[PDB]
Amino acid sequence: PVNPCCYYPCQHQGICVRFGLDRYQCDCTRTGYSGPNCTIPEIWTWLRTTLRPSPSFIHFLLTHGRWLWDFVNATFIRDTLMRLVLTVRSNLIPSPPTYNIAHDYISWESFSNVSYYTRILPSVPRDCPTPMGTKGKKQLPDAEFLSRRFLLRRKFIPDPQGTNLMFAFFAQHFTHQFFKTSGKMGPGFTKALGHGVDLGHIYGDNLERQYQLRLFKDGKLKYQMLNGEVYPPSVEEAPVLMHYPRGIPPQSQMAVGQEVFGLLPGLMLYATIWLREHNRVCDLLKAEHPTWGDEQLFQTARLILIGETIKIVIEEYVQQLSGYFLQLKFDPELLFGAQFQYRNRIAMEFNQLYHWHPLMPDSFRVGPQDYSYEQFLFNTSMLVDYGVEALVDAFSRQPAGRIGGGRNIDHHILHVAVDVIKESRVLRLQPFNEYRKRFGMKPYTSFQELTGEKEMAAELEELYGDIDALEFYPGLLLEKCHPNSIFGESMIEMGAPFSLKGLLGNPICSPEYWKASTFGGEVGFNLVKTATLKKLVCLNTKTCPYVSFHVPD
Amino acid sequence: PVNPCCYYPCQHQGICVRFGLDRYQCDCTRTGYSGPNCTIPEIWTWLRTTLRPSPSFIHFLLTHGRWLWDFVNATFIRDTLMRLVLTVRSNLIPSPPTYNIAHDYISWESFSNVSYYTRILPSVPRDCPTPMGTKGKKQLPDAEFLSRRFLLRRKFIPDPQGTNLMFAFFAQHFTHQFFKTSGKMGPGFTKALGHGVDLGHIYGDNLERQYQLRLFKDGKLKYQMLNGEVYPPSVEEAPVLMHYPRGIPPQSQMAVGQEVFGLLPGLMLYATIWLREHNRVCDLLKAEHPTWGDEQLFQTARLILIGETIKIVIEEYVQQLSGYFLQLKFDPELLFGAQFQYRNRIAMEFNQLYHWHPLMPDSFRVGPQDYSYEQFLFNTSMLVDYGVEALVDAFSRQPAGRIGGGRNIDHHILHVAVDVIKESRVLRLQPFNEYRKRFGMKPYTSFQELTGEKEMAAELEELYGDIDALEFYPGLLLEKCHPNSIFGESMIEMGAPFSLKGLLGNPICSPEYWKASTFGGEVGFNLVKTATLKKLVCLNTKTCPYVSFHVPD
Ligand SMILES: *[C@@H]1O[C@H](CO)[C@@H](O[C@@H]2O[C@H](CO)[C@@H](O[C@@H]3O[C@H](CO[C@@H]4O[C@H](CO)[C@@H](O)[C@H](O[C@H]5O[C@H](CO)[C@@H](O)[C@H](O)[C@@H]5O)[C@@H]4O)[C@@H](O)[C@H](O)[C@@H]3O)[C@H](O)[C@H]2NC(C)=O)[C@H](O)[C@H]1NC(C)=O
Ligand SMILES: *[C@@H]1O[C@H](CO)[C@@H](O[C@@H]2O[C@H](CO)[C@@H](O[C@@H]3O[C@H](CO[C@@H]4O[C@H](CO)[C@@H](O)[C@H](O[C@H]5O[C@H](CO)[C@@H](O)[C@H](O)[C@@H]5O)[C@@H]4O)[C@@H](O)[C@H](O)[C@@H]3O)[C@H](O)[C@H]2NC(C)=O)[C@H](O)[C@H]1NC(C)=O
Ligand code: COH
Ligand code: COH
Ligand SMILES: *[C@@H]1O[C@H](CO)[C@@H](O[C@@H]2O[C@H](CO)[C@@H](O)[C@H](O)[C@H]2NC(C)=O)[C@H](O)[C@H]1NC(C)=O
Ligand SMILES: *[C@@H]1O[C@H](CO)[C@@H](O[C@@H]2O[C@H](CO)[C@@H](O)[C@H](O)[C@H]2NC(C)=O)[C@H](O)[C@H]1NC(C)=O
Ligand SMILES: *[C@@H]1O[C@H](CO)[C@@H](O[C@H]2O[C@H](CO)[C@@H](O)[C@H](O)[C@H]2NC(C)=O)[C@H](O)[C@H]1NC(C)=O
Ligand SMILES: *[C@@H]1O[C@H](CO)[C@@H](O[C@H]2O[C@H](CO)[C@@H](O)[C@H](O)[C@H]2NC(C)=O)[C@H](O)[C@H]1NC(C)=O
Ligand SMILES: CCCCC/C=C\C/C=C\C/C=C\C/C=C\CCCC(=O)O
Ligand SMILES: CCCCC/C=C\C/C=C\C/C=C\C/C=C\CCCC(=O)O
Ligand SMILES: CCCCCCCCO[C@@H]1O[C@H](CO)[C@@H](O)[C@H](O)[C@H]1O
Ligand SMILES: CCCCCCCCO[C@@H]1O[C@H](CO)[C@@H](O)[C@H](O)[C@H]1O
Ligand SMILES: CCCCCCCCO[C@@H]1O[C@H](CO)[C@@H](O)[C@H](O)[C@H]1O
Numbered sequence A, B: 001p002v003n004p005c006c007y008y009p010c011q012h013q014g015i016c017v018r019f020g021l022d023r024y025q026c027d028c029t030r031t032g033y034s035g036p037n038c039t040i041p042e043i044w045t046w047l048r049t050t051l052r053p054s055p056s057f058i059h060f061l062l063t064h065g066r067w068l069w070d071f072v073n074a075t076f077i078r079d080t081l082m083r084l085v086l087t088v089r090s091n092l093i094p095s096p097p098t099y100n101i102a103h104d105y106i107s108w109e110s111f112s113n114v115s116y117y118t119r120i121l122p123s124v125p126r127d128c129p130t131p132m133g134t135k136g137k138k139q140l141p142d143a144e145f146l147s148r149r150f151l152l153r154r155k156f157i158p159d160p161q162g163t164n165l166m167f168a169f170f171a172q173h174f175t176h177q178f179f180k181t182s183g184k185m186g187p188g189f190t191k192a193l194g195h196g197v198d199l200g201h202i203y204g205d206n207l208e209r210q211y212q213l214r215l216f217k218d219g220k221l222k223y224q225m226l227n228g229e230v231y232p233p234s235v236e237e238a239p240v241l242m243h244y245p246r247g248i249p250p251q252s253q254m255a256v257g258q259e260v261f262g263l264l265p266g267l268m269l270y271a272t273i274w275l276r277e278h279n280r281v282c283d284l285l286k287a288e289h290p291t292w293g294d295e296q297l298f299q300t301a302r303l304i305l306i307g308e309t310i311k312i313v314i315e316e317y318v319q320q321l322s323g324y325f326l327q328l329k330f331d332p333e334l335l336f337g338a339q340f341q342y343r344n345r346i347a348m349e350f351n352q353l354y355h356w357h358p359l360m361p362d363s364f365r366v367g368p369q370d371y372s373y374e375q376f377l378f379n380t381s382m383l384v385d386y387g388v389e390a391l392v393d394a395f396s397r398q399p400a401g402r403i404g405g406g407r408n409i410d411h412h413i414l415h416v417a418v419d420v421i422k423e424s425r426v427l428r429l430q431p432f433n434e435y436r437k438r439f440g441m442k443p444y445t446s447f448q449e450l451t452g453e454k455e456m457a458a459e460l461e462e463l464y465g466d467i468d469a470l471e472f473y474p475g476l477l478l479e480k481c482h483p484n485s486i487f488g489e490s491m492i493e494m495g496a497p498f499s500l501k502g503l504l505g506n507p508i509c510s511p512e513y514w515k516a517s518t519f520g521g522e523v524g525f526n527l528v529k530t531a532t533l534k535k536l537v538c539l540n541t542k543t544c545p546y547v548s549f550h551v552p553d
């Protein structure tokens, strides 16, 4: 008997449950629908669904009225929209969390074992006809082929939104605090417990490692002057597990908090920047609170960075990305009147979706010089050689690459993408379409409809045999980009929910914590309330270079 | 310079912060008050405080209108009150959690290190004049003396509310899943991570121990027939760490999930009862879901018990306790429209406050027999000798003891109480009065006012020198009981908030989880929605004895 839940009968988030040897029941509870498979809109659901504009349309309004927006921007109408934005979007990620690689059903294990990444949709039953469930071929496209054929960059396509490398890296560094898949435990597990913006990639992810990094004096972090400028310390004082290549484990072999952050100047760069900031906060705090210990100074400064980060990420990172005219804003109080759970837990689909490797260029221009992957990767002096000031200016100036569209992932790293499609399969993630529904969209009716063109499209149909069988990662990256956008529809509609749910779900954002005494003093709060990429740098360097998440000109 | 926060200047939950070498500032944020120390009621706070009846009064209404209540009971007016009850009470326990033994301020460490118990009020600064802060003597009463003098039982005072031993034990067993102080880590730390009703005292508190107990077949739990009746298994199959005395580690040396549950028949009794229930659920589930695995069967049945427990605890345990005419009710949906965080974290004051050791009798009557502490403690056959049926009937019939009033803790265990007063001091818990304010009450103006009498009172003043210096645990147990109540005012007003916050804060109670498919089937939900002490027993025994949380007659 074929496991009925293999057809995904239940609609609108209705839970599919096996009853007896061959039947199933949908638990349409609170889905707004009723019926065998939840397809009978309650009175209000019916209204809502007949009045809600297509996402396509909203993205339109949000990217056009360059007059209506400037007005709306200078009025409460902003807070109103922002509050709307958050709620609606954030109301899509189940919390408390639901399933994990081990359980396709609620369980006390799932709730509490923070090691497990969590999923939005159950997984494809280990007994369904096809690998994706019902449609498709008994075999999925060879990820190696599907990769070089559609994801491999031929000619470098830059990002029309003007995104830049200074962003590309920040993106990598930042996301690496919640995404830390434990090789030992395999796919679907994570070292980075905490699931969020806890900067556990600066201060590390275990008390020890933290301590090993902590200079236990003035709540500061350990560091070393090179050329008279401050940099992170090396294992020779900061005796902590790293990943530098077997060659010079002593000097220029720096400890940071994120095990792998030495393998690229970009990461190590930012790493230098944040550490150099933390210690800066301390100086301020310490002057404001002489009678304070070390632990305090440390903890308080940390939170002030969890704030600064959550702010820059929203009012600048997500801004650039969106392309909106609405001026996104970070004000924890906007949700003070809603029903919101301050608690997140990184999802595997969120992980998958965040693999924006095509942002990476062809080479790395740092002034007249023009390093290559060989010269760049694992390099171990570019940072101290060039200097923060100079290296930020260099990244803030070179453009990044379009994330979507298809065929724009440099070859060097093209391997990452192949593993994702490999991993995705191990995890048994449901089909793109299934995830499209889940995030409030319509399933594509054809590859032609998916991809703006016809070539790529036809070739894929020929492979997957059915649009419904298409996969999560390939779809997202093979989907047509919104006009002049960094990427298509599905990336925002699927990403934003995971994104803001995690940004505002941080404890520091709850009413309980969002006080001026949580950042010890009014000086703390204001540091969190007025943060900026520009300040994050120019306040920790001798000189103010050019910096932003978008190229100038 | 004396640490100003030693005076506890800030009022109404205003955070005290040291600024400079000798000053301080109160962060009255969202306290409803403003001013140097938060003593200027906002317009509405002023209304609220001038219209809110004394707690003393409400306890009166709740324990008198035996006509108005029967009516109110048979109408929506019930749900209204219940919803009121929850919210207001639960809105007193900060969540996300605040401080811990290590930090008297918000911190990412405090939030995430689940090992730390958490506190409501900061601690007494390690530099304040007196041990309690400002008032009192440079030395606190000798806990040994203060104990025998006021907490040691002379004549057994039974509980007027009719509470019984069947309750006394359930109480002990149940509370032992959140209270597990780690000796290695010391006071203020806990083995029982999870902080709540996760039955991590049945299924254990680590995957291993659980597994070691799991019979990995039909999602059941390991067990052994003795006399033809089901009992937990012994380490000889359930190879797990226990605590039975060095004598017969083989048979009658049962494994349960709560390391110390062999040291008393009461605990082991209940232990037998729940295990015998879990397996029962499985039988039901398994028949409803043949196509189900083991993991599911297990996890689903677990949740069905986390439900059953949370229900019996509320509609029966808290009922008996309260003395209310209002018929408490467990309906997770009553909070569906509120702003409630489904997340708890046991507090140390909650721990302290729950030390109801005086519930314990003088001897243990089990029919014509009348065991003593020697015969009872560590006994290891009474359970299988007598039998669940018979031993429940025996406890449900013998009365327990009044918790408050003073002088009612049997000598045998009188030692526990002494450690509590010792520990309390290590933790540096603020004075009774400070905790009285914090939970919405008025500080006592005298010991005479505290204690209903004059003798005990005068002697204490003579010791503490000042009512304000009085301690948390001694105050609670030395406070005058509400007329005919099991204990006084401060126990309910301080206990209920910690209590319901933890009962309804359980993930299974959130909208997300409270579906019929979380207990797999409608059969599951109903098991959770109609649980009862009576059913918990009589459905897992050959015969229905007498059982309740109050003696008959
Ligand atoms: C979060 O969740 C992950 C799992 O998803 C946790 O990590 C896994 O943890 C389990 C258990 O800790 C571990 O178990 C594996 O299973 C092996 C099988 O064990 C044997 O088979 C049964 C199972 O208990 C026993 O009957 C066997 O008999 C034993 O009985 C004696 C009793 O004393 C034993 O002493 C003796 O060895 C005997 O064989 C036997 O145990 C197990 O042996 C082996 O250890 C193996 O690891 C998983 O492998 C873990 N790893 C992962 C990533 O899956 C993780 O701990 C959870 N996080 C937290 C903190 O809760
Ligand atoms: C929850 O929170 C509790 C704490 O409240 C955690 O448990 C405690 O954890 C800490 C650290 O893991 C542990 O530390 C103690 O401190 C000793 C001091 O260590 C020395 O002094 C400093 C501190 O790092 C170092 O400079 C010293 O030099 C060392 O440097 C080398 C670097 O490689 C070392 O290899 C070498 O040994 C050298 O000495 C030195 O480390 C520490 O040595 C000792 O281990 C001691 O335990 C506490 O004792 C822990 N216990 C408790 C209950 O307090 C708990 O882990 C947290 N929970 C979680 C899971 O996060
Ligand atoms: C948008 C973020 C981002 C960027 C810009 C980025 C840029 C680069 C880059 C350019 C200099 C190189 C050489 C690599 C190289 C790798 N990356 Co990324 N990675 C990024 C996000 C990730 C994530 C997420 C993972 C998966 C593992 C994890 O962290 O959970 C990853 C994994 C990898 C792996 C391990 C195998 C795999 O999972 O496929 C390699 C090798 N990489 N990455
Ligand atoms: C209302 C619950 C309850 C009951 C009825 C109860 C009944 C009994 C009892 C009667 C047969 C005996 C002989 C004991 C004996 C002890 N109890 Co309790 N205890 C109870 C709740 C606790 C708590 C709570 C602790 C503190 C440790 C922990 O679990 O965190 C405790 C601790 C102890 C300790 C360790 C030292 C200490 O912390 O003081 C001993 C010994 N006991 N207990
Ligand atoms: C790491 O980066 C440094 C730059 O700091 C590389 O050295 C540069 O190499 C280019 C040519 O490759 C020269 O024209 C520059 O003048 C060099 N700068 C300096 C001061 O070294 C170095 O080759 C890189 N290392 C690796 C592993 O390739
Ligand atoms: C443990 O409990 C048993 C009861 O099961 C105790 O045995 C009883 O002892 C009394 C007198 O103390 C006798 O009158 C009963 O008839 C006995 N019952 C049985 C069948 O043993 C036993 O003494 C206790 N053990 C300890 C350590 O005291
Ligand atoms: C509910 O979901 C099932 C599964 O998709 C739908 O399909 C079943 O019934 C169809 C109607 O004739 C048949 O086409 C299929 O043979 C049958 N498939 C399965 C898996 O049972 C069913 O139609 C849906 N019902 C509604 C209300 O649309
Ligand atoms: C605010 O709190 C402080 C601390 O309790 C109060 O006490 C200070 O001021 C009092 C007024 O004269 C003096 O009696 C004390 O010397 C002084 N003590 C301290 C610790 O500074 C202060 O009065 C309070 N202010 C208000 C508005 O009541
Ligand atoms: C859980 C930790 C925090 C993770 C998230 C932080 C940054 C994620 C970056 C992008 C998220 C995915 C899609 C974003 C696209 C447009 C943003 C605006 C959407 C909106 O508002 O309408
Ligand atoms: C965190 C896990 C759950 C712990 C709590 C479970 C049981 C606790 C028992 C008693 C709690 C403290 C005081 C109770 C007194 C009266 C109850 C009704 C109060 C009310 O409603 O007005
Ligand atoms: C408590 C009421 C808060 C304000 C309610 C605003 C209702 C907006 O409802 C609609 O929701 C849609 C989501 O699909 C959006 O796309 C629309 O722009 C929005 O107008
Ligand atoms: C003019 C802007 C009006 C408000 C825009 C809200 C932006 C989010 O947009 C909407 O969010 C919902 C929640 O996930 C989704 O169901 C919809 O598909 C999406 O378009
Ligand atoms: C208040 C109404 C303002 C004008 C609304 C015009 C909506 C135009 O429609 C939009 O056009 C885009 C490109 O032209 C498409 O990509 C979108 O799918 C479509 O919604």
Ligand SMILES: CCCCCCCCO[C@@H]1O[C@H](CO)[C@@H](O)[C@H](O)[C@H]1O
Binding pocket: A060, A061, A062, A064, A065, A066, A067, A068, A072, A077
């Ligand atoms: C406050 C939010 C109201 C809903 C979104 C309105 C989006 C308006 O969008 C744009 O407005 C311009 C006005 O000058 C027109 O010229 C554009 O054609 C129109 O698409």
Ligand SMILES: CCCCCCCCO[C@@H]1O[C@H](CO)[C@@H](O)[C@H](O)[C@H]1O
Binding pocket: B052, B053, B058, B084, B088
């Ligand atoms: C959203 C409105 C929900 C119902 C509001 C009921 C207001 C009850 O307000 C009062 O609060 C006091 C707390 O100190 C109780 O003691 C009183 O009995 C209660 O009447």
Ligand SMILES: CCCCCCCCO[C@@H]1O[C@H](CO)[C@@H](O)[C@H](O)[C@H]1O
Binding pocket: B054, B055, B056, B058, B061, B062, B081, B084, B085, B088, B089, B090, B092, B439, B440, B441, B493, B497
């Ligand atoms: C007739 C019953 C009306 C509602 C009774 C509410 C029971 C709780 O009572 C009140 O709870 C508040 C919240 O902690 C406290 O501030 C008050 O001190 C307490 O009396």
Ligand SMILES: CCCCCCCCO[C@@H]1O[C@H](CO)[C@@H](O)[C@H](O)[C@H]1O
Binding pocket: B056, B057, B058, B060
């Ligand atoms: C609606 C009003 C109904 C009658 C209210 C009578 C309140 C009586 O008052 C109560 O008396 C108790 C003992 O007599 C005291 O213990 C309480 O402190 C007091 O509030």
Ligand SMILES: CCCCCCCCO[C@@H]1O[C@H](CO)[C@@H](O)[C@H](O)[C@H]1O
Binding pocket: B060, B061, B062, B064, B065, B066, B067, B068, B072, B077
């Ligand atoms: C629905 C809740 C209303 C507020 C609580 C009312 C408590 C009433 O309390 C009791 O009511 C009896 C009525 O017969 C009187 O005889 C008692 O003296 C009075 O104390």
